[PDB]
Design a protein around this ligand. Structure first.
Ligand SMILES: CN(Cc1ccccc1C(=O)NCC1CCC1)Cc1ccc2c(c1C(=O)O)OC[C@H](CCC(=O)O)O2
Ligand SMILES: CN(Cc1ccccc1C(=O)NCC1CCC1)Cc1ccc2c(c1C(=O)O)OC[C@H](CCC(=O)O)O2
Ligand SMILES: [Cl-]
Ligand SMILES: [Cl-]
Lengths: 149, 149
């Protein structure tokens, strides 16, 4: 579980927000892209895996699972590329709730930036720092450090 | 020390590579930008601080120290913005060595991507995973987890 991430794609303002969620902690990374291509997804995963020890990524849809560009990046970065079938139905609900939460936060900050990308990064910050008591940012570090040691 | 980062700006292919170094671990994040503006720097810090618990940033030059856009992002993200004066002369040498190391890695991967940005993310990955024995990626997580406890 320390190395398992889930991709998630949501839409706002006619743009796409691509999110990676560290399953065990709820920590997220996100970016705004014009559209969700294999190339955009590949580059996002390359960034993610240089920053965290990404063992497995559950892709967000079948196009990204199929994409040879995505497969090439997963090969490059040593990531096991997996499907995102919610064999546990709870997963489906967790991601939906997360997208709702992120959109709520983006609304709360939207007037503090001209560009959506900036608002999205503010929302990532708020999400990862929120105490629920530990934050998701605290949980991911604890989980990974425990795994190392 | 768990929360101290240093900014660093280097050039390649007529573009700018903006780097943040976690001083205690040598872990890095980096991006390619057309030029090093206050706005680009501010956005980079916003991203960094949503991902790691950034307490203090030593800015890379006086323009970024002065920039009201950079100051606004540091205010937003709760970062103490500081100068980057190398009171310890070892700091200069460490950064110079790191830029040289990064450029070496970029050269080693350069033909594996059309775009410089991709090569830079590959270099970040290699740098952070390199065992010198622990990697910078392991050291940063251990340092931060120890601090949380
Ligand atoms: C310049 N504005 C002014 C602004 C405009 C409108 C409302 C509030 C503000 C304001 O001052 N907000 C408080 C700031 C935000 C953190 C503290 C903010 C900003 C900074 C860096 C960026 C931005 C933006 C943006 O407006 O979205 O957009 C993407 C860009 C990408 C990098 C590049 O392209 O250079 O980096
Ligand atoms: C498509 N190429 C093909 C290629 C071209 C030349 C040499 C090797 C390859 C090749 O297959 N390399 C191995 C791959 C690389 C990891 C495994 C790679 C690539 C993927 C995503 C990107 C890229 C690039 C790029 O070429 O730099 O550029 C930035 C872009 C940004 C996001 C967006 O704008 O969509 O994301
Ligand atoms: Cl955090
Ligand atoms: Cl790593």
């Amino acid at each position: 579980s320390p190395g398992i991430w889930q991709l998630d794609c949501t839409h706002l303002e006619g743009k796409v927000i691509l999110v990676a969620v560290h399953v065990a902690s709820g920590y997220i990374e996100a970016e705004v892209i014009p559209a969700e291509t294999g190339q955009e997804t590949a580059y996002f995963l390359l960034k993610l895996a240089g920053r965290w020890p990404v063992k497995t990524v559950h892709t967000d849809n079948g196009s990204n699972f199929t994409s040879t560009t995505v497969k090439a990046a997963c090969w490059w970065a040593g990531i096991k590329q997996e499907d995102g079938i919610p064999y546990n139905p709870q997963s489906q609900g967790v991601i939906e709730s997360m997208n709702k939460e992120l959109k709520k936060i983006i609304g709360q900050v939207r007037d503090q930036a001209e560009h959506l990308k900036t608002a999205v990064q503010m929302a990532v910050f708020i999400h990862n720092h929120k105490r629920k008591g530990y934050s998701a940012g605290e949980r991911i570090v604890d989980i990974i450090a425990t795994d190392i040691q």
